[PDB]
């Protein structure tokens, strides 16, 4: 039994959050915040991922310089990332360097110069990651595939932005939008490991009481999404593995069926060639895919946001003569989660998922991200017992029922990358979402 | 990390407040000890496999109805196999962990089949990075055998079965294997450990055939997939300071979109090349690495030359500062290995084979600025430098131009 | 019908003294008026191959165990053909009829059927 | 072979009593003297395809009508294209060259599907040899660049069309041509040289991008295809007398069914190994090498500490006899050399396009006891050896320990 | 017909004066008529490519030709499947129209016919 999460507020509204583990002696401090990517419009699509670089490039009191010294000296590091929904900014330390890792997140928070020279600077390094995604497959099918799936809506948008913005982003767009979206009520600051709550309430006191308060508070992790059944096919002969995406419109954070959506992803669930273990997974898709040599891997996922989400799976395949067997038989499976799924394969997942949830949160950062996470999309933290109790009220009847209503017979986005000749077109492939035998 | 004995056996653990436990295996098995090249690595991709009492596959459909996971790796001085389940399935762990140092049925097409081509994909994807290549290269030139046995099995000398059942039959034994359950009540452990592995051989404590000695010298690894080069120089007094040393000279950056204030990290600036120094303690040698790897082998050259004036800038002076930034980069490094669970096991793993005591990151020496200078000057004044290049190799520098 | 169901119960035969005391020199005669040592065959030459399960214990074969079944059945098959039988060291004698791959297609099938139940398991 | 000019073109000839004549172009464009990887036997694989006269084809077609053949090699010092032919068809011949030197197409296609191909099968047929490759790794230890370069063109480092355009832009101009015509009435030839190399561009003579530097090392190249080991010793003054020791070393057996009585011969009695001394003379440079073969690491091993023993020993004492069968099996070497219409060539070439007047086999300098145990004594004690160790690496010799 | 024959005739029309004067401007109505254009078409997209000659003509276009040939190919497909033309940038302008298989074609067929010729050669 993990120690209780201790959670606290503001004046502002800032929540405070904290999981201390006396068996540690590094702590993980940060800001998660509820605002994102989907936050910005057309025009300035790209700002929120602009604003991370220029983060780090100096405040009103540090120069660029003088942060590198100062987190040098401190000894552990800072990280950040910007997502669709969420935007994270964190310090990993020792146990008695959390007041300077606070202080300093909240200055380049705050405080930040985003000075026209250090703009014109990093317009030209973002630039360029434009050019470099390019080679990280998975996401180039990710970033393909919610911009198909929610097509002109502005969860279909990349979070680098367009090249055109990129080149027109000024000082007074990135301020007016860290103004409107990083407000108190939107933020949570999170301590995980070494880290006393009572301590770190105090610096938040001291450091981020300043922080503005938005004029209509809704409560944290609040958002209409329309899934567009679509491909997006990216040949490219001379790719030796072909990378393909499959996924039908999911669920939310929030809704009923997420525990539901989760023991039928486990169902179905991973699969990679060079692990030694995963030849003989319970699994059915894997054992086909194994025997048949059908892929290199497979990776089922269900992505939430607040108000939608995909549920599908991602193939990675050297088997350029089989994609159709590899897509025919995925589908398949996903049939048999309407069709055929009894107690046996659902109490199995079950019990996969209850140990899975637990193990996922391993070190600082993990439990820091994931109280950050849940906090800024279900506004509390679920404990460990409330999960087990919702995990086991899925029956299968709930699961043939979802599968009933999101997988069977449904438009799906499809997105390929690769030697792809050989997958069929959307028909062929949007056919197999039902079985003519039921 | 309540050090103790069950049956024989060294067995070490750590209660917690969580709901996961980690158990891990240690033997003395790495490379180090191999008898055969490659048999280290064979040895840790054949753990889990048929065992007499549970088949492989009977293993992997039971573990996934615990929720349970597993994970191995082979160093230079252990092999690792560990697993990650609830704190109430311990018992269960306990007992396939005997199986499988007791009964391993070791067949030949396990390893045709199985185990030889997992142990093949394992290289290959650990190879796609060049510096990964460069600082093994750069093992094998300054130790030439024991330390410089490969790690990993390949495709020019294979491994047979009757080398890695040779090689079962002494690494898993008593004197050769300890126990480190991470959030794992110790008095319980030792009872389960006790019982399950009371049948276990004696055997020996497996050594390392011949002395470890130092040379210099270059290897030249001609591949097509990426540039990299490592500067290592064999240390024939391993101490702590080169800890302190090689967090101060650094080259990651402990920022996003930032160069780094460390000495490696300001070298790298003006190209698409990254840096990182390295200290390899191994008891009775040390390795200290900087390794550089960049997509054009123009900008590797000029860094690799900025890295070793570097090194000789350290030689000649320290301030206080950066004493002082070296000794928080290095507790904060020492802290963060005792918390990931692989090297968390290997680290008491030494503590328990060997008799290294471990040094706690809140023991973690503050080196002046004179005894910092003064290992650095040792460095840039070495007998024997290594320099290791993968890539274009002809447009990588060489050992004497630097 | 498997061998792992041929060789279970063959071995309740053997262990049972009065059934073993019938039924082996019974099968020594079958054995003997069968004839497949006549052509120099071994009694596993004669096992169905066509099958994915004793393909791959035919993969599994020690190469010299391999190259010598596939001398036998070429042989058997130029025997066969002329309407002649072995003579002299072409003859299999009994000591020589050892069941060489009994044992692999036993781990193949020891596989396929756990492989069967555990895909049927109830958590209880 | 009188030497003469024509046209610019420097030409030797030698007019004998035979039906079959030798015209060989020798061009200075050897691997020294390459700007990338691999272009000068890119280069030489290029020579006779399509010209703008005449195709490939018909080429081939036409040299079958008058028998003839046709026969090119790349050095580091020379590429050289030989025709042989019967003597009253030397007009043709000479037509042939000077349209290849003019007006060859180099045209992509013809890289991507004639002549790389062939380049590659070159190259693997040599390689089939380990000894090839021990050797060929020594020189590039030794020298890095220039003489250092590789001779044959390899994957890892692609030769473009416009690379060999270039090289070819530079090597096919009337400065870097030698023609040699054995068994060709000498007057005949400079009449016809003059005639059809007139057009040839000037151009300027090819140099080696930096001078000759000298290093040692070792060169570990892992193969599953054969065990060879070569020892080599850089020379920084290239003296005849090397040649003198390299034979008197010797290696090879001089009847068949016999070890022979060399004391490199002599090192191999009781081992399956074979072993050969030889020595390369490169004008500002040289090296001594000997190169052992084996099927057995052990062997070679075994065979490379007597090896360089019998060096030491010669630096010792050499007698009377010995010296006396040193002067006899050089006098040999070079007779055959320079009857060998593949090594004729380059050396008259080399007396054409460099300067290095030939030495005549009855010229060959008598060395002394007192000369030979000198030369041997300055190799044994030697700065800079280099070791190239093919096959199974980890159990030949290194440097170090020789 | 082979393009060798196609472009030595056009060649011989193209010298004369006269022919010349008559030819161009039937050709270049010929071709406005002919709409291959309109499907943003180069002329050599449309030769026959069956055939082992233009197999090898193919394989040796530069790589960034082979890519938008396939582009234009693909493309005039779906203007035909959906009963379109091409519109703005996707119609060929006759500045656009470069022969760039041509010099290919022509070389494969020229060894060809040299290969026939030579075949047939009678030592005199």
């Given at each position: 039994?993990?120690?209780?999460?201790?959670?606290?507020?503001?004046?502002?509204?800032?929540?405070?959050?904290?999981?201390?583990?006396?068996?540690?002696?590094?702590?993980?401090?940060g800001?998660?915040?509820?605002?994102?990517?989907?936050?910005?419009?057309?025009?300035?699509?790209?700002?929120?991922?602009?604003f991370?670089?220029?983060?780090?490039?100096?405040?009103?009191?540090?120069?660029?310089?003088?942060?590198?010294?100062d987190?040098?000296?401190?000894?552990?590091?800072?990280?950040?990332?910007?997502?669709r929904?969420?935007?994270?900014?964190?310090?990993?330390?020792?146990?008695?360097?959390?007041?300077?890792?606070?202080?300093?997140?909240?200055?380049?928070?705050?405080?930040?110069?985003?000075?026209?020279?250090?703009i014109?600077?990093?317009?030209?390094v973002?630039?360029?990651?434009?050019?470099?995604?390019?080679?990280?497959?998975?996401?180039?099918?990710?970033?393909?595939?919610?911009?198909?799936?929610?097509?002109?809506?502005?969860?279909?948008?990349?979070?680098?932005?367009?090249?055109?913005?990129?080149?027109?982003?000024?000082?007074?767009?990135?301020?007016?939008?860290?103004?409107?979206?990083?407000?108190?009520?939107?933020?949570?600051?999170?301590?995980?490991?070494?880290?006393?709550?009572?301590?770190?309430?105090?610096?938040?006191?001291?450091?981020?009481?300043?922080?503005?308060?938005?004029?209509?508070?809704?409560?944290?992790?609040?958002?209409?999404?329309?899934?567009?059944?679509?491909?997006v096919?990216?040949?490219?002969?001379?790719?030796?593995?072909?990378?393909?995406?499959?996924?039908?419109?999911?669920?939310?954070?929030?809704?009923?069926?997420?525990?539901?959506?989760?023991?039928?992803?486990?169902?179905?669930?991973?699969?990679?060639?060079?692990?030694?273990?995963?030849?003989?997974?319970?699994?059915?898709?894997?054992?086909?895919?194994?025997?048949?040599?059908?892929?290199?891997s497979?990776?089922?996922?269900?992505?939430?946001?607040?108000?939608?989400?995909?549920?599908?799976?991602?193939?990675?395949?050297?088997?350029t003569?089989?994609?159709?067997?590899?897509?025919?038989?995925?589908?398949?499976?996903?049939?048999?989660?309407?069709?055929?799924?009894?107690?046996?394969?659902?109490?199995?997942?079950?019990?996969?998922?209850?140990?899975?949830?637990?193990?996922?949160?391993?070190g600082?950062?993990?439990?820091?991200?994931?109280?950050?996470?849940?906090?800024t999309?279900?506004?509390?933290?679920?404990?460990?017992?409330?999960?087990?109790?919702?995990?086991?009220?899925?029956?299968?009847?709930?699961?043939?029922?979802?599968?009933?209503?999101?997988?069977?017979?449904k438009?799906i986005?499809?997105?390929?990358?690769?030697?792809?000749?050989?997958?069929?077109?959307?028909?062929?492939?949007?056919?197999?979402?039902?079985?003519?035998?039921? | 990390?309540?050090?103790?004995?069950?049956?024989?056996?060294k067995?070490?653990?750590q209660?917690?407040?969580?709901?996961?436990?980690?158990?891990?295996?240690?033997?003395?098995?790495?490379?180090?000890?191999?008898?055969?090249?490659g048999?280290?690595?064979?040895?840790?991709?054949?753990?889990?496999?048929?065992?007499?009492?549970?088949?492989?596959?009977?293993?992997?459909?039971?573990?996934?109805?615990?929720?349970?996971?597993?994970?191995?790796?082979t160093?230079?001085?252990?092999?690792?196999?560990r697993?990650?389940?609830?704190?109430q399935?311990?018992p269960?762990?306990?007992?396939?962990?005997?199986?499988?140092?007791?009964?391993?049925?070791?067949?030949?097409?396990?390893?045709?089949?199985?185990?030889?081509?997992?142990?093949?994909?394992?290289?290959?994807?650990?190879?796609?990075?060049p510096?990964?290549?460069?600082?093994?290269?750069?093992?094998?030139?300054?130790?030439?055998?024991?330390?410089?046995?490969?790690?990993?099995?390949?495709?020019?000398?294979?491994?047979?079965?009757?080398?890695?059942?040779?090689?079962?039959?002494?690494?898993?034994?008593?004197?050769?294997?300890?126990?480190?359950?991470?959030?794992?009540?110790?008095?319980?452990?030792?009872?389960?450990?006790?019982?399950?592995?009371?049948?276990?051989?004696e055997?020996?404590?497996?050594?390392?055939?011949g002395?470890?000695?130092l040379?210099?010298?270059?290897?030249?690894?001609?591949?097509?997939?990426?540039?990299?080069?490592?500067?290592?120089?064999?240390?024939?007094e391993?101490?702590?300071?080169?800890?302190?040393?090689?967090?101060?000279?650094?080259?990651?950056?402990?920022?996003?979109?930032?160069?780094?204030?460390?000495?490696?990290?300001?070298?790298?600036?003006?190209?698409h090349?990254?840096?990182?120094?390295?200290?390899?303690?191994?008891?009775?040698?040390?390795?200290?690495?900087?390794?550089?790897?960049?997509?054009?082998?123009?900008?590797?050259?000029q860094?690799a030359?900025?890295?070793?004036?570097?090194?000789?800038?350290?030689?000649?002076?320290?301030?206080?500062?950066?004493?002082?930034?070296?000794?928080?980069?290095?507790?904060?490094?020492?802290?963060?290995?005792?918390?990931?669970?692989?090297?968390?096991?290997?680290?008491?793993?030494?503590?328990?084979?060997?008799?290294?005591?471990?040094?706690?990151?809140?023991?973690?020496?503050?080196?002046?600025?004179?005894?910092?200078?003064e290992?650095?000057?040792?460095?840039?004044?070495?007998?024997?430098?290594?320099?290791?290049?993968?890539?274009?190799?002809?447009?990588?520098?060489?050992?004497?131009?630097? | 019908?498997?061998?792992?169901?041929?060789?279970?119960?063959?071995?309740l035969?053997?262990?049972?003294?009065?059934?073993?005391?019938?039924?082996?020199?019974?099968?020594?005669?079958?054995?003997?008026?069968?004839?497949?040592?006549?052509?120099?065959?071994?009694?596993?030459?004669?096992?169905?191959?066509?099958?994915?399960?004793?393909?791959?214990?035919?993969?599994?074969?020690?190469?010299?165990?391999?190259?010598?079944?596939?001398?036998?059945?070429?042989?058997?098959?130029?025997?066969?053909?002329?309407?002649?039988?072995?003579?002299?060291?072409?003859?299999?004698?009994?000591?020589?009829?050892?069941?060489?791959?009994?044992?692999?297609?036993?781990?193949?099938?020891?596989?396929?059927?756990?492989?069967?139940?555990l895909?049927?398991?109830?958590?209880?």
């Open positions: 039994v993990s120690p209780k999460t201790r959670t606290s507020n503001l004046k502002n509204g800032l929540t405070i959050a904290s999981e201390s583990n006396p068996l540690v002696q590094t702590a993980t401090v800001v998660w915040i509820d605002a994102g990517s989907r936050n910005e419009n057309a025009y300035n699509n790209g700002t929120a991922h602009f991370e670089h220029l983060a780090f490039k100096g405040t009103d009191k540090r120069s660029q310089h003088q942060l590198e010294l987190i040098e000296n401190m000894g552990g590091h800072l990280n950040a990332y910007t997502s929904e969420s935007t994270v900014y964190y310090a990993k330390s020792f146990k008695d360097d959390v007041p300077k890792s606070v202080e300093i997140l909240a200055d380049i928070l705050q405080h930040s110069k985003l000075a026209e020279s250090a014109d600077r990093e317009r030209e973002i630039t360029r990651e434009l050019e470099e995604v390019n080679k990280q497959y998975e996401e180039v099918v990710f970033d393909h595939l919610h911009a198909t799936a929610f097509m002109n809506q502005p969860l279909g948008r990349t979070i680098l932005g367009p090249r055109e913005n990129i080149q027109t982003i000024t000082n007074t767009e990135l301020r007016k939008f860290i103004t409107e979206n990083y407000t108190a009520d939107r933020m949570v600051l999170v301590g995980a490991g070494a880290v006393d709550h009572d301590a770190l309430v105090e610096l938040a006191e001291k450091y981020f009481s300043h922080l503005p308060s938005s004029q209509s508070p809704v409560p944290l992790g609040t958002p209409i999404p329309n899934f567009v059944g679509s491909e096919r990216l040949r490219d002969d001379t790719m030796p593995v072909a990378h393909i995406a499959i996924a039908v419109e999911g669920v939310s954070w929030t809704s009923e069926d997420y525990y539901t959506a989760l023991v039928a992803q486990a169902i179905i669930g991973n699969y990679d060639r060079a692990v030694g273990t995963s030849r003989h997974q319970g699994s059915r898709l894997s054992n086909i895919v194994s025997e048949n040599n059908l892929a290199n497979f990776q089922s996922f269900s992505t939430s946001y607040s108000d939608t989400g995909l549920w599908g799976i991602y193939l990675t395949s050297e088997n003569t089989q994609i159709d067997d590899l897509v025919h038989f995925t589908l398949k499976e996903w049939n048999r989660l309407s069709t055929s799924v009894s107690n046996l394969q659902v109490e199995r997942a079950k019990s996969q998922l209850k140990a899975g949830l637990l193990l996922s949160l391993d600082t950062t993990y439990v820091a991200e994931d109280i950050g996470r849940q906090l999309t279900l506004g509390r933290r679920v404990t460990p017992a409330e999960v087990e109790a919702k995990l086991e009220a899925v029956t299968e009847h709930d699961v043939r029922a979802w599968a009933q209503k999101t997988l069977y017979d438009d986005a499809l997105v390929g990358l690769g030697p792809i000749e050989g997958l069929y077109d959307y028909n062929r492939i949007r056919n197999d979402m039902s079985m003519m035998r039921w | 990390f309540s050090t103790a004995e069950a049956a024989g056996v067995v070490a653990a209660d917690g407040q969580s709901p996961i436990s980690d158990l891990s295996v240690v033997l003395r098995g790495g490379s180090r000890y191999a008898t055969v090249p048999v280290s690595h064979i040895l840790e991709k054949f753990a889990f496999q048929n065992t007499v009492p549970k088949s492989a596959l009977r293993f992997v459909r039971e573990l996934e109805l615990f929720g349970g996971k597993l994970y191995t790796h160093t230079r001085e252990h092999i690792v196999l697993t990650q389940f609830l704190k399935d311990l269960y762990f306990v007992d396939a962990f005997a199986n499988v140092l007791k009964e391993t049925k070791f067949q030949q097409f396990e390893l045709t089949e199985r185990v030889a081509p997992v142990a093949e994909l394992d290289l290959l994807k650990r190879e796609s990075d510096a990964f290549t460069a600082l093994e290269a750069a093992h094998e030139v300054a130790f030439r055998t024991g330390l410089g046995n490969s790690v990993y099995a390949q495709g020019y000398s294979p491994v047979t079965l009757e080398d890695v059942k040779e090689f079962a039959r002494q690494v898993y034994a008593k004197q050769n294997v300890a126990v480190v359950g991470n959030n794992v009540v110790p008095a319980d452990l030792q009872q389960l450990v006790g019982t399950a592995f009371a049948d276990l051989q055997g020996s404590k497996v050594t390392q055939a002395t470890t000695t040379h210099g010298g270059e290897a030249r690894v001609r591949t097509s997939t990426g540039n990299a080069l490592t500067i290592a120089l064999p240390i024939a391993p101490k702590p300071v080169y800890h302190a040393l090689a967090s101060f000279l650094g080259g990651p950056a402990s920022m996003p979109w930032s160069v780094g204030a460390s000495p490696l990290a300001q070298a790298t600036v003006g190209t090349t990254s840096v990182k120094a390295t200290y390899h303690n191994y008891g009775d040698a040390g390795l200290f690495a900087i390794t550089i790897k960049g997509d054009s082998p123009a900008e590797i050259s860094v030359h900025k890295a070793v004036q570097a090194l000789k800038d350290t030689g000649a002076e320290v301030t206080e500062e950066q004493a002082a930034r070296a000794y928080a980069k290095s507790k904060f490094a020492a802290a963060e290995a005792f918390e990931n669970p692989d090297s968390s096991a290997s680290v008491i793993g030494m503590e328990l084979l060997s008799g290294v005591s471990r040094i706690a990151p809140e023991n973690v020496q503050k080196f002046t600025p004179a005894e910092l200078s290992a650095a000057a040792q460095l840039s004044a070495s007998a024997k430098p290594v320099v290791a290049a993968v890539g274009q190799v002809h447009a990588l520098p060489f050992a004497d131009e630097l | 019908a498997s061998i792992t169901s041929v060789v279970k119960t063959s071995e035969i053997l262990k049972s003294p009065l059934l073993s005391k019938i039924v082996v020199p019974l099968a020594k005669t079958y054995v003997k008026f069968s004839g497949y040592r006549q052509l120099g065959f071994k009694m596993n030459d004669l096992i169905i191959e066509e099958t994915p399960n004793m393909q791959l214990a035919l993969r599994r074969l020690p190469p010299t165990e391999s190259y010598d079944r596939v001398y036998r059945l070429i042989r058997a098959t130029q025997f066969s053909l002329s309407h002649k039988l072995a003579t002299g060291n072409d003859i299999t004698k009994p000591e020589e009829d050892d069941h060489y791959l009994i044992p692999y297609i036993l781990d193949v099938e020891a596989e396929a059927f756990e492989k069967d139940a895909d049927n398991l109830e958590v209880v």
